[PDB]
Amino acid sequence: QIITTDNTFVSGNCDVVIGIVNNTVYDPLQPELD
Amino acid sequence: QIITTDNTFVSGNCDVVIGIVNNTVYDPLQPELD
Ligand SMILES: *[C@@H]1O[C@H](CO)[C@@H](O)[C@H](O)[C@H]1NC(C)=O
Ligand SMILES: *[C@@H]1O[C@H](CO)[C@@H](O)[C@H](O)[C@H]1NC(C)=O
Protein backbone atom coordinates (compact mmCIF):
# COMPACT_ATOMS: atom_id res chain seq x y z
CA GLN A 1 0.00 0.00 0.00
CA ILE A 2 0.96 3.65 -0.40
CA ILE A 3 2.53 5.08 2.76
CA THR A 4 -0.14 7.36 4.20
CA THR A 5 -0.90 9.20 7.45
CA ASP A 6 -3.88 6.87 8.01
CA ASN A 7 -1.79 3.80 8.88
CA THR A 8 1.14 5.78 10.36
CA PHE A 9 1.37 7.80 13.57
CA VAL A 10 4.02 10.36 14.51
CA SER A 11 6.02 10.09 17.74
CA GLY A 12 8.96 12.41 18.33
CA ASN A 13 11.84 13.31 16.05
CA CYS A 14 13.94 10.95 13.92
CA ASP A 15 17.23 11.72 15.70
CA VAL A 16 16.64 9.19 18.49
CA VAL A 17 15.72 6.24 16.21
CA ILE A 18 18.67 4.15 14.99
CA GLY A 19 18.72 3.28 11.30
CA ILE A 20 15.95 5.57 10.03
CA VAL A 21 15.52 6.52 6.36
CA ASN A 22 13.78 9.28 4.38
CA ASN A 23 10.64 8.99 2.26
CA THR A 24 7.54 11.08 1.60
CA VAL A 25 4.39 10.40 3.63
CA TYR A 26 1.42 11.24 1.41
CA ASP A 27 -1.27 13.28 3.16
CA PRO A 28 -4.59 12.64 1.33
CA LEU A 29 -5.86 16.13 2.26
CA GLN A 30 -3.31 17.71 -0.10
CA PRO A 31 -4.68 16.40 -3.46
CA GLU A 32 -8.22 17.21 -2.27
CA LEU A 33 -7.63 20.90 -1.32
CA ASP A 34 -11.34 21.49 -0.71
CA GLN B 1 -0.50 12.93 24.01
CA ILE B 2 -2.97 15.71 23.26
CA ILE B 3 -6.60 14.58 23.00
CA THR B 4 -7.21 14.49 19.24
CA THR B 5 -10.05 13.15 17.07
CA ASP B 6 -7.73 10.42 15.71
CA ASN B 7 -7.53 8.66 19.11
CA THR B 8 -11.14 9.08 20.31
CA PHE B 9 -14.53 7.96 18.99
CA VAL B 10 -17.90 9.43 19.93
CA SER B 11 -20.95 7.41 21.02
CA GLY B 12 -24.07 9.30 22.09
CA ASN B 13 -24.50 12.17 24.51
CA CYS B 14 -22.75 12.75 27.84
CA ASP B 15 -25.91 12.74 29.98
CA VAL B 16 -25.80 8.96 30.51
CA VAL B 17 -22.13 8.63 31.58
CA ILE B 18 -21.55 8.66 35.35
CA GLY B 19 -18.76 10.92 36.59
CA ILE B 20 -17.87 12.39 33.19
CA VAL B 21 -16.04 15.73 33.03
CA ASN B 22 -15.74 18.50 30.44
CA ASN B 23 -12.63 19.02 28.30
CA THR B 24 -11.70 20.28 24.85
CA VAL B 25 -10.86 17.80 22.08
CA TYR B 26 -8.47 19.05 19.41
CA ASP B 27 -9.70 18.83 15.82
CA PRO B 28 -6.55 18.57 13.65
CA LEU B 29 -8.31 19.86 10.52
CA GLN B 30 -9.30 23.16 12.18
CA PRO B 31 -5.79 24.75 12.21
CA GLU B 32 -5.36 23.45 8.65
CA LEU B 33 -8.55 25.27 7.51
CA ASP B 34 -8.63 23.35 4.23
C1 LIG C 1 17.19 12.60 5.78
O1 LIG C 1 17.19 14.02 5.53
C2 LIG C 1 17.93 14.80 6.48
C3 LIG C 1 17.75 16.25 6.10
O2 LIG C 1 17.91 16.45 4.70
C4 LIG C 1 19.39 14.36 6.49
O3 LIG C 1 20.10 15.10 7.49
C5 LIG C 1 19.49 12.87 6.78
O4 LIG C 1 20.84 12.44 6.69
C6 LIG C 1 18.63 12.07 5.79
N1 LIG C 1 18.67 10.66 6.11
C7 LIG C 1 19.43 9.78 5.45
C8 LIG C 1 19.34 8.35 5.91
O5 LIG C 1 20.16 10.11 4.52
C1 LIG D 1 -20.02 20.31 32.10
O1 LIG D 1 -20.98 20.83 31.14
C2 LIG D 1 -22.36 20.64 31.52
C3 LIG D 1 -23.20 21.17 30.38
O2 LIG D 1 -22.77 22.47 29.98
C4 LIG D 1 -22.64 21.34 32.84
O3 LIG D 1 -23.98 21.09 33.24
C5 LIG D 1 -21.67 20.85 33.91
O4 LIG D 1 -21.87 21.58 35.12
C6 LIG D 1 -20.22 21.00 33.45
N1 LIG D 1 -19.31 20.47 34.45
C7 LIG D 1 -18.20 21.10 34.84
C8 LIG D 1 -17.38 20.40 35.88
O5 LIG D 1 -17.87 22.18 34.37
From Swiss-Prot, chains A, B:
Glycans are attached at residue 22. Subunit of the fusion protein that is processed upon entry into the host cell. Mediates fusion of the virion and cellular membranes by functioning as a class I viral fusion protein. Contains a viral fusion peptide that is unmasked after S2 cleavage. This cleavage can occur at the cell membrane by host TMPRSS2 or during endocytosis by host CSTL. In either case, this triggers an extensive and irreversible conformational change that leads to fusion of the viral envelope with the cellular cytoplasmic membrane, releasing viral genomic RNA into the host cell cytoplasm. This is Spike protein S2'. It comes from Severe acute respiratory syndrome coronavirus 2. The chain holds residues 1113 to 1146 of 1273 of the full protein.
